[PDB]
Design a protein around this ligand. Structure first.
Ligand SMILES: N[C@@H](Cc1ccc(Cl)cc1)C(=O)O
Ligand SMILES: N[C@@H](Cc1ccc(Cl)cc1)C(=O)O
Lengths: 266, 266
């Protein structure tokens, strides 16, 4: 005889962070489309974070990213081909620099998605962080057109919001793409357009930067006769909409009563 | 003071079965190519396992599968659209019947991969089982050609054996495909051609079977103007080659000293 309705050994039950779940789902969505996930370093060179992406200093466009500038020596920032690069250190303001690193280290055609923690000097409120996550996308190859960028996002939406979802593209500006664009997806439930991220056809100058850096490293040009599209989307804003989180500050808050709430989710 | 090199609480450490790992890897390989995994029932109707696939009785081709015939009443075998079908019960001799079930329940274009336990009345030796696993593939859609079947397998190989791998196709016979084929992949390490599975362009009569069954269920024809390819490969033979298992009988042997050996693997 035993009271079988009696509690059992208190073995701990784990869980994954909301961002991990969201990032995972996103990565799966694109894996099904032939994209592979790779990461980049959080501490970057001004060259990779800005210059290589067609974003020079004193440029009005560089104001789109409030940079955290770093200092200190003894630190070894390593480049794409493992080599020891230089440049003013800073915390990457977006995952974009990674599409330059990847391109100098591989050859087209290819599909990549790169998730990552990004940093920006900004005031932390209920829907704004200085430390958040993005998910970049980059598909390069001969004959790649903007019709493909639009199809990718269409697929992203369907996968994220169902058959009654739909995408919308509006021209927007980014120094690393041309044509450039911002896209929104239709959220049937909340019944409204969510501005998800920006995108566009990789910029001529970005390809040139890649090949120039390649030469300097002894590699042969690989992006002379190919085109490609890239995109980037904020993760928290989407995780919040999706998991119904009211305050973006929770993610990095570390509160268990909060985190524990996502054990179930997948 | 504590002897920190002293054993800790003996919390149990789990593990996954070799077939699960192999099946998983296979499913991932194809997910990246846009395939989605679905399953079918182990107990089947002669109609789905044979007739629907262009394999009639007393046919010399039906001898390619030694069937386990079942008996007993009260059992409810459910069809594709959840309805209660009939026919002589048997243990499926391959996963193929599932490509008929899926097709009457959905519309093209699409990509599916269906893993599954199959049964065949055969003598169990070191490299032969009566109970094993297959992985079917079926890609239907307007304009689908044999050039695509060949590309899929090419991708399968690369993903399974590296850049120095290569595929080979030879004409072979199957009542449910035409052209029909058998394919082998080059295994650089062991340096030899491994005959992996059969494939081919879905047979006209299979599409007709699907649409006929659809009508009988009130659904409209969906496979009149589309073509498609399918393939099927034995899982154990591949898991063995891959994990270096000497005896196929181990998988269903249930021996822990055996299973425990795969905890690490992924
Ligand atoms: N990473 C950019 C978003 C982006 C725009 C365009 C492209 Cl093509 C890719 C990403 C940002 O931080 O605003
Ligand atoms: N399922 C078949 C193998 C197969 C052959 C051809 C195709 Cl198209 C698909 C699968 C068998 O059990 O032998």
């Amino acid at each position: 005889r035993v009271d079988v309705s009696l509690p059992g050994a208190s073995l701990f039950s784990g869980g994954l962070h909301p961002i991990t779940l969201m990032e995972r789902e996103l990565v799966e969505i694109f894996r099904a489309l032939g994209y592979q996930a790779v990461e980049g370093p959080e501490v970057e060179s001004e060259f990779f974070n800005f210059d290589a992406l067609n974003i020079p200093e004193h440029h009005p466009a560089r104001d789109m990213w409030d940079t955290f500038w770093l200092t200190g020596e003894g630190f070894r920032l390593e480049g794409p081909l493992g080599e020891e690069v230089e440049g003013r250190l800073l915390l990457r303001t977006h995952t974009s620099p990674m599409q330059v690193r990847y391109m100098v280290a591989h050859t087209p055609p290819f599909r990549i998605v790169v998730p990552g923690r990004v940093f920006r000097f900004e005031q932390t409120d209920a829907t704004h962080e200085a430390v958040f996550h993005q998910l970049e996308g980059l598909v390069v190859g001969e004959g790649i057109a903007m019709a493909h960028l639009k199809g990718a996002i269409y697929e992203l939406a369907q996968a994220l919001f169902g058959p009654d979802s739909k995408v919308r593209f509006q021209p927007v500006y980014f120094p690393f793409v041309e044509p450039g664009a911002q896209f929104a997806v239709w959220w049937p439930e909340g019944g409204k357009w969510l501005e998800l991220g920006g995108a566009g056809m990789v910029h001529p100058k970005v390809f040139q930067a890649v090949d120039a850096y390649r030469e300097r490293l002894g590699l042969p040009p690989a992006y002379r006769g190919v085109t490609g599209f890239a995109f980037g989307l904020g993760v928290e804003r989407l995780a919040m909409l999706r998991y119904g989180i009211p305050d973006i500050r929770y993610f990095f808050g570390g509160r268990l009563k909060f985190l524990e709430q996502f054990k179930g989710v997948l």
